Design an enzyme around this catalytic site. Sequence first.
Site, PDB file in Angstrom:
ATOM      1  CB  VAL A   1     -16.799 -22.357 -23.939  1.00 29.99           C
ATOM      2  CG1 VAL A   1     -18.213 -22.917 -23.820  1.00 29.99           C
ATOM      3  CG2 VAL A   1     -16.730 -21.178 -24.917  1.00 29.99           C
ATOM      4  N   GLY A   2     -14.083 -21.822 -21.455  1.00 32.42           N
ATOM      5  CA  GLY A   2     -12.641 -22.008 -21.328  1.00 32.42           C
ATOM      6  C   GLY A   2     -11.889 -20.860 -21.975  1.00 32.42           C
TER       7      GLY A   2
ATOM      8  CB  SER B   1     -11.117 -16.146 -21.288  1.00 29.70           C
ATOM      9  OG  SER B   1     -11.722 -14.881 -21.081  1.00 29.70           O
ATOM     10  CB  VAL B   2     -12.949 -18.589 -25.756  1.00 29.04           C
ATOM     11  CG1 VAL B   2     -14.048 -19.114 -26.661  1.00 29.04           C
ATOM     12  CG2 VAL B   2     -11.781 -18.104 -26.577  1.00 29.04           C
TER      13      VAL B   2
ATOM     14  CE  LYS C   1      -7.454 -16.268 -28.647  1.00 24.70           C
ATOM     15  NZ  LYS C   1      -6.409 -16.913 -29.498  1.00 24.70           N
TER      16      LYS C   1
ATOM     17  CG  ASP D   1      -1.290 -23.292 -34.432  1.00 24.91           C
ATOM     18  OD1 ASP D   1      -0.358 -23.134 -35.255  1.00 24.91           O
ATOM     19  OD2 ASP D   1      -1.171 -24.014 -33.415  1.00 24.91           O
TER      20      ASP D   1
HETATM   21  C1  LIG Z   1       0.280 -16.498 -32.661  1.00 28.06           C
HETATM   22  C2  LIG Z   1      -0.662 -17.259 -33.596  1.00 28.06           C
HETATM   23  C3  LIG Z   1      -0.249 -18.449 -34.210  1.00 28.06           C
HETATM   24  C4  LIG Z   1      -1.126 -19.128 -35.062  1.00 28.06           C
HETATM   25  C5  LIG Z   1      -2.413 -18.625 -35.298  1.00 28.06           C
HETATM   26  N1  LIG Z   1      -3.243 -19.274 -36.123  1.00 28.06           N
HETATM   27  N2  LIG Z   1      -2.872 -19.787 -37.180  1.00 28.06           N
HETATM   28  C6  LIG Z   1      -3.929 -20.347 -37.761  1.00 28.06           C
HETATM   29  C7  LIG Z   1      -3.899 -21.096 -39.096  1.00 28.06           C
HETATM   30  C8  LIG Z   1      -2.483 -21.619 -39.345  1.00 28.06           C
HETATM   31  C9  LIG Z   1      -4.313 -20.138 -40.212  1.00 28.06           C
HETATM   32  C10 LIG Z   1      -4.861 -22.275 -39.030  1.00 28.06           C
HETATM   33  C11 LIG Z   1      -5.005 -20.151 -37.010  1.00 28.06           C
HETATM   34  C12 LIG Z   1      -4.552 -19.469 -35.967  1.00 28.06           C
HETATM   35  N3  LIG Z   1      -5.296 -19.050 -34.948  1.00 28.06           N
HETATM   36  C13 LIG Z   1      -6.021 -19.893 -34.219  1.00 28.06           C
HETATM   37  O1  LIG Z   1      -6.045 -21.100 -34.460  1.00 28.06           O
HETATM   38  N4  LIG Z   1      -6.726 -19.332 -33.231  1.00 28.06           N
HETATM   39  C14 LIG Z   1      -7.506 -19.978 -32.349  1.00 28.06           C
HETATM   40  N5  LIG Z   1      -7.833 -19.483 -31.154  1.00 28.06           N
HETATM   41  C15 LIG Z   1      -8.624 -20.279 -30.403  1.00 28.06           C
HETATM   42  C16 LIG Z   1      -9.097 -19.862 -29.007  1.00 28.06           C
HETATM   43  C17 LIG Z   1     -10.627 -19.818 -28.880  1.00 28.06           C
HETATM   44  O2  LIG Z   1     -11.361 -20.380 -29.992  1.00 28.06           O
HETATM   45  C18 LIG Z   1     -12.313 -19.436 -30.535  1.00 28.06           C
HETATM   46  C19 LIG Z   1     -11.952 -18.583 -31.576  1.00 28.06           C
HETATM   47  C20 LIG Z   1     -12.708 -17.439 -31.817  1.00 28.06           C
HETATM   48  C21 LIG Z   1     -12.341 -16.589 -32.859  1.00 28.06           C
HETATM   49  C22 LIG Z   1     -11.226 -16.884 -33.649  1.00 28.06           C
HETATM   50  C23 LIG Z   1     -10.468 -18.027 -33.412  1.00 28.06           C
HETATM   51  C24 LIG Z   1     -10.840 -18.872 -32.373  1.00 28.06           C
HETATM   52  C25 LIG Z   1      -8.955 -21.454 -30.975  1.00 28.06           C
HETATM   53  S1  LIG Z   1      -8.234 -21.494 -32.493  1.00 28.06           S
HETATM   54  C26 LIG Z   1      -2.804 -17.432 -34.686  1.00 28.06           C
HETATM   55  C27 LIG Z   1      -1.938 -16.752 -33.833  1.00 28.06           C
END
Ligand SMILES: Cc1ccc(-n2nc(C(C)(C)C)cc2NC(=O)Nc2nc(CCOCc3ccccc3)cs2)cc1
Length: 331
Positions: free
Chosen positions: A27-28, A29-30, A45, A160
């Site tokens: 789904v767009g 890796s993920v 992810k 994020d």
């Molecule tokens: C370098 C860094 C900076 C900030 C953060 N960070 N800070 C926060 C909070 C500030 C706590 C909200 C949340 C994150 N992390 C994310 O948003 N991660 C995401 N990754 C995706 C890609 C695929 O979606 C599926 C998926 C699957 C499994 C896990 C997550 C996502 C979407 S949302 C992390 C790393």
Amino acid sequence: ERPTFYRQELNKTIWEVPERYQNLSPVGSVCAAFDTKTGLRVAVKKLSRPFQSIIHAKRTYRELRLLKHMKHENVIGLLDVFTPARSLEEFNDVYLVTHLMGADLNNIVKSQKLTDDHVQFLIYQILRGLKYIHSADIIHRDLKPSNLAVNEDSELKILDFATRWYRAPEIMLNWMHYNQTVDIWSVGCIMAELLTGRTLFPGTDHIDQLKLILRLVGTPGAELLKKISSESARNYIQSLTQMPKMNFANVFIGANPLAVDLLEKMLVLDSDKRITAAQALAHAYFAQYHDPDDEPVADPYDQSLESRDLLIDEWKSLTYDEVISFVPPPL
Ligand SMILES: Cc1ccc(-n2nc(C(C)(C)C)cc2NC(=O)Nc2nc(CCOCc3ccccc3)cs2)cc1
Ligand SMILES: CCCCCCCCO[C@@H]1O[C@H](CO)[C@@H](O)[C@H](O)[C@H]1O
């Protein structure tokens, strides 16, 4: 017991995952899958070039410790993290698993104009989450609709990843120090949208963004000049033709009396004078949803441990230990 994995290919990649996770689609890796232990739909992810550079390892390590630490109804926690490596030396891949939200706040309904009840509950949630986030000593810095996860029933999560539309003026300008009220600014621009159906600051570029902000909130007050340390900007701030802050009632025509009061307290040009995420929860406007006995705080989070100069191998070890240490949530 180390569960049983399997090999699968979807595009240019060898995704190795436990049997637990099924019907795997990219789904767009993920990739999105079905967890069979829990009975939930999940997004997995697989981490891109985990230890390519120092900057990659550093990024991977940081991502984990954050979400590993993240446990809140309105913030993106982790359901799992796994690796098909039975030891450190063979360890070279990270997969992260959280519950799949259907859409973002753009396409739940950022198209049309929503109801006050609907925006109350929506904002209440983001604010419920900002509180948690902010009590961790953490500032989101990039809050916007495409960064809020919503299911079919308006149950909101923060994560994020035009963008600048929701940024606080002091970020546009790039004052190198700032506080948590930068995210409050985002909420105001997010809320204001949800109330009028139109973008509050439709900036076409950095300056237009800045110039449209002053059009509402007025020029900087005489009490704000005292905080500007940069002569560069300080002399420019003067040269302007002083602007009265616009009357919000006539900007939010027919809107909730209390929602208008909230938007004033939130969209304060001076950050120091904006409302805290915790304060905003107590505001009359959320009387409906505000449960003061269920708006928890986090533990303090160590952002110093994550900002170091260590070798490729030294992050790889630190990161590995995390995966070993992870214990999933209950349900
Ligand atoms: C370098 C860094 C900076 C900030 C953060 N960070 N800070 C926060 C909070 C500030 C706590 C909200 C949340 C994150 N992390 C994310 O948003 N991660 C995401 N990754 C995706 C890609 C695929 O979606 C599926 C998926 C699957 C499994 C896990 C997550 C996502 C979407 S949302 C992390 C790393
Ligand atoms: C045209 C100039 C626009 C003014 C934007 C600055 C308003 C932000 O407010 C400022 O935030 C800074 C960090 O958050 C702090 O240094 C100051 O204490 C605070 O007043």
